[PDB]
Amino acid sequence: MKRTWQPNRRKRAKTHGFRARMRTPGGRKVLKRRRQKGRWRLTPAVRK
Amino acid sequence: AVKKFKPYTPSRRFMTVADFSEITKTEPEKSLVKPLKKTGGRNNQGRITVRFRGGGHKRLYRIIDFKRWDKVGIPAKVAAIEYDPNRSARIALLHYVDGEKRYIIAPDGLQVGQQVVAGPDAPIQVGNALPLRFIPVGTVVHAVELEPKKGAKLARAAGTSAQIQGREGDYVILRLPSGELRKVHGECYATVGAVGNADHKNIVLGKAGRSRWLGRRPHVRGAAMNPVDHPHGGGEGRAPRGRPPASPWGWQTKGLKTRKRRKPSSRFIIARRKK
RNA sequence: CCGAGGGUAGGGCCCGUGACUGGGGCGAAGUCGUAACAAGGUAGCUGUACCGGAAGGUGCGGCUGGAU
RNA sequence: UGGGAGAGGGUGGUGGAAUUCCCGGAGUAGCGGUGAAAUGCGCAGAUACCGGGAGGAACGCCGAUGGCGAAGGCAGCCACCUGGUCCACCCGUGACGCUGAGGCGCGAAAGCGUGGGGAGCAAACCGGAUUAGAUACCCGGGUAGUCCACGCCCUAAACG
RNA sequence: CGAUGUCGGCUCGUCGCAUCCUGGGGCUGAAGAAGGUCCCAAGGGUUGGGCUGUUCGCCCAUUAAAGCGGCACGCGAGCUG
RNA sequence: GAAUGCCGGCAUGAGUAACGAUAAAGAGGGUGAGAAUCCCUCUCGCCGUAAGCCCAAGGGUUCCUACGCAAUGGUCGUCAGCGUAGGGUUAGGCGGGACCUAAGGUGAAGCCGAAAGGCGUAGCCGAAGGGCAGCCGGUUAAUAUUCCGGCCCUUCCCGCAGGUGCGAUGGGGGGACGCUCUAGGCUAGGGGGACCGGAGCCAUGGACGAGCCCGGCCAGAAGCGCAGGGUGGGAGGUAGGCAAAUCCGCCUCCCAACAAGCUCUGCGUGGUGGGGAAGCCCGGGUGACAACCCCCCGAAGCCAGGGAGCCAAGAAAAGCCUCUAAGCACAACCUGCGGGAACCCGUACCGCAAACCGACACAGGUGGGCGGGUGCAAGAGCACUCAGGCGCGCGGGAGAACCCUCGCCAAGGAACUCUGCAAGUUGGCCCCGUAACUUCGGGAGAAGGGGUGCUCCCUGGGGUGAUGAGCCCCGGGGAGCCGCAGUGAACAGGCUCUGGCGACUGUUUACCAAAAACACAGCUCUCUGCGAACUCGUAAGAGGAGGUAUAGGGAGCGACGCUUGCCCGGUGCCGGAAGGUCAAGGGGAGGGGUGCAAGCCCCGAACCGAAGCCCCGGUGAACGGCGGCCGUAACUAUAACGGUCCUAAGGUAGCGAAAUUCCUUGUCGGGUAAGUUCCGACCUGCACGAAAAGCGUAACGACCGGAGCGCUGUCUCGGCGAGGGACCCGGUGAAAUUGAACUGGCCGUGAAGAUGCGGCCUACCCGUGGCAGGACGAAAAGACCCCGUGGAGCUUUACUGCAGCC
RNA sequence: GAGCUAGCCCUGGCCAGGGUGAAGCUGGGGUGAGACCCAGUGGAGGCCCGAACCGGUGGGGGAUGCAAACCCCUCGGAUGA
């Protein structure tokens, strides 16, 4: 049946993407935390 | 002259439609239409603030002339009478001798090819707009401004009208469509006649699908819900109200008045509606 | 081929009968009231409507086949 | 052909008297109601009185033992549309007449549908009183209805 | 109670005997036939339907008879629901 | 040494289940160390509105070639979507961007909020919508509307020539729109040809034939032809289109009007450029100078912005055309022609799936286009087949039980069972015929019956064409033939009677309930005069609504029919400028602390003083409520009638053992051989009852009862047969569970149900296929139940607050 | 976090074939005029049958599954809420 993951590149980029995070107090804290933790990717990769 | 149908489906048995007899032009004036942005009942927050709205037929908004003191003394010809889906009244397309074109609400009895005019000395004739002070007592009017130059506010739906009862200083006394007696300032414009399409109220929608066409989504009784949802929610089996009948938000809904007490316009209302 | 009739299926008219039910007729001396006949003690009657244990009452209009 | 009388019918206007309610003024201890009362209303200011307003329904006098219509029925006043009818003259048609099973239309009230309207009145209903009772008669309230439009109903002591 | 699945049915039996029938008896208010009552006896047998979820019970048509109980009210790692 | 402890390792179950659709395989020949599994050929089977082909998303080298097989592949592997390496994606015209706007998002102005932030007009962003210029063929191992070839086209820049008041982000036009139905003409696609081209074939009884078999086109600029779309021309006036305007709008006049002209598409033709089969021979060659023609069918596509009808009344903006404004008229714009200029990103491959979403090469899920032929009335249905694609990545045997899916069955025919559950039956089309009831539509495919193939003969009308022929479509009558059987296979209602509930089509507990529940048109009450009420928000601001009482919110009821009674004492709500109570505040009689005093400071009575509450009324489709006892009739019985107590008032019409009735399988009647169910009645209704509506109701229902007919493996009562498993052999090889075990029966005992204790009995050691009585078998720290001064949802006249409102 | 699901907003797309035959319109009849009747035309509808598509009624199978909701048979809707 129809499962929950239905990939959509524009959806992915517009929702979790770098510019979405920077636009918002909480999203910037996301970027700030993932930098402090040393994440290699701060944001989900998507082909665009 | 509401039209019936033979019972050739279960729903056609009761359905009635308007006869559309007065309509003479079945496509709108292109320079006068705008896109009418549906809300679904949602506000600028995305939140439903009026329940059970959405899903109706697409409509274009037809701009209407609710001022008419815009063109004092300039007569116009009634070019056509048209269907307007944003309102129960029909609308009349006016060709001013100016060349300008405008829509008004089409009063009852208004004929295509006749002339209307607005102003302090327009004839007292169906379709003409004057300040209220210059309209003789006893006259039936519609599209009544409520305050000078603010736009027609009262008696705009199909069949409705207000009557001029008397005068008092700068104000006239109207009996509104609801039967309330109210003082409206004499410089407020109004239009001789009653609104047309008085048969409108006799239309029998006929089936649930018809309400859906109009953008009306199914209304859920509170008694049909659970207590997380409504004062009337819950109970094993059916249940009477078991408390004073109430809205989803808990306020009482059989009798409880709701007009604000200290509202400044109270000085201008003579008799609240009756019946 | 037609054909007495037999069979299958579905209709129409009539008769009989049926738990129970409706009112009708009748029946020397039952129970309740007293509507009508006198102005019958609220003139009667009337078509209709609503109501009432019951006769009946009341509303609307009509008739005199009503009195003084 | 020339005239006549008439609440004959339909539409639309519009006139005053009265009732009710509302507003203002003035005024105080009751008013109302009956056979007598009581319910009811009234010092939160009624009744009685004056001025204003709103709304519905019915048209006093004239009015009659009257008039009109086929009947049911029709009553302020005005205009318009319209029917029946009578008289004069003796002009025209030339028996073209009578009645009429069916059919069709009309048909008081009450009632029914859908809108409207609602002052007065008032089935139902409530209360007061009377009474052995009083699902009545009398009194205080009062909803349909009574009014308008369209559509039904088609009854009668629709009787001379 | 860190789980012993709980009515009825179906299937499959097996046991007790306070025995429904069949076999053997004594008493009889046992003429005969047919019963009643008690004793001995558990080898075998103990039907098909209507109603109800029903167990049970009533009813129909039969029968030699249409027995009563136990087995976690036998049997859901066998079925049904 | 234990914590259903933690991490890791390794056992048991076990050579056990399984190896993922029952579309299916066999053989020969290659290769290789090794082959059921890789390659080739022949035979067989499966899909074919796909299981084929082309797009979009998503995926991201999986593409092609060489080398290779440790692991991955459910077996094998020489093979592969795997390992290593090399190669491969080419655009002014395809798609997106340098164009437009949609919701929405963002947001100079501006508004709001402790902060973070929230809004917000214009503007900007935003597409699978608008707009915009490329078709056919060839080529590569792998890209192609991209390279090549042929024939077309767009914009930008510059110049030449001609023409014109040129000029815009501003005005106007246009762009520009629904649903259903639909005309004419075409194209796509398809069928046939006794015509044209073709390698060949004659078999096994016959055929050298009007035989068989294969193919018979595609793209094309200008011009031309056919079919369509779009559009009146002139003149005068002019105050409107937020400046101007010759434009547009409005008024008038003349003329034109189912046309025509102009304009723009579609289709046809068209210089020219391509393609071109079977077969035969090693993707290629040949066929081949290939032929490329006629007839018919024919779109849902095209002409298109076409026509008609209808109500629920159907985007925007740019491109484009026109108007003028500053300006400029040595400019500029328009037309034609010529030269130059033309950027960025995508392009491989998978794409109903082994490459996407489901942990897997997973029987699931995934939007658009094409989707051939024949027959069956039609069709995208069904059967078979084309092109193309597959046989589903373990096999080989055997022919037990048992399971699954399937076929048949003597006599019976629901006796099965909670229930005809399940499975039979029926089954398409044509014709005949069809009841109660009804809201007149319906019920209706009611029911029930008849026909159905093939052959010859006669004949009716329509399309194309020509009026005929041919092809094609709908028939009509007569005579025959065969079989058990003619919708001969596949696809395709069993019917009826009668109740309950709900009017109806719809909706729902994703994944145990599809219903009588929700919704529904419709009815009523109620609030709301507009900066409405109400809702979301602290606010600003939104929705309501660019609506205005024939409208909007809330509530109940639930099509329709006939109806909806009595109670306002309590609660609610509505009305009530009196009266009672009433907080802050006003007021300050009169006290007190202190100070030598002036003073400073404190307490404080009457009285004035809102809402609310009290109080007086109203109000039921507001919350709600609608009695008890005793007596009485000339047979008995029962009480129309009476007495009395209480109430705010004592349940009306209608209905009633009911989806409600406890006693209960009430009683009587019907149906049955028999009926706790069903239906009709009665009424002592435990405990119906009138918008939490009452009683009905045609039609409707995968709802729930009861009955009958038809027919059956449901059953008496089972039997046989088929295939997939189970079983055996080769390959690969799990699981929960598990204190250890050398793990029998009885009768007892024991914490009360013992393989493990006692006494007896029985018993050689170890497996394999089976069955499930036990191991109080497994699974899940019982959901029930209780306990915890544990938690959470929900309610209210529990307590106490808060929003909101007064 | 609304790439699942629920509602709404914007913009597109999809629904083989067959059946029934409303209004209107035309004509005929009818009448003083009418209503109205009949035939033809017409093509309405939360109309009917049935694929795609959307569902999920009953039963069976599956139950360490092909699958953490699947499979087979059967069944509802299919121009509309």
Ligand SMILES: O=C(N[C@H](CO)[C@H](O)c1ccc([N+](=O)[O-])cc1)C(Cl)Cl
């Ligand atoms: O809870 C169950 N049964 C328990 C066993 O732990 C017990 O046997 C039981 C069964 C039935 C019962 N009853 O009918 O009341 C009570 C307890 C089973 Cl349903 Cl899992």
Ligand SMILES: [Mg+2]
């Ligand atoms: Mg889903």
Ligand SMILES: [Mg+2]
């Ligand atoms: Mg995307």
Ligand SMILES: [Mg+2]
């Ligand atoms: Mg996307």
Ligand SMILES: [Mg+2]
């Ligand atoms: Mg997205």
Ligand SMILES: [Mg+2]
């Ligand atoms: Mg976002």
Ligand SMILES: [Mg+2]
């Ligand atoms: Mg982003």
Ligand SMILES: [Mg+2]
């Ligand atoms: Mg911050």
Ligand SMILES: [Mg+2]
């Ligand atoms: Mg910050």
Ligand SMILES: [Mg+2]
């Ligand atoms: Mg990481």
Ligand SMILES: [Mg+2]
């Ligand atoms: Mg790094």
Ligand SMILES: [Mg+2]
């Ligand atoms: Mg991140």
Ligand SMILES: [Mg+2]
């Ligand atoms: Mg109708």
Ligand SMILES: [Mg+2]
């Ligand atoms: Mg009708």
Ligand SMILES: [Mg+2]
């Ligand atoms: Mg109209």
Ligand SMILES: [Mg+2]
């Ligand atoms: Mg526009």
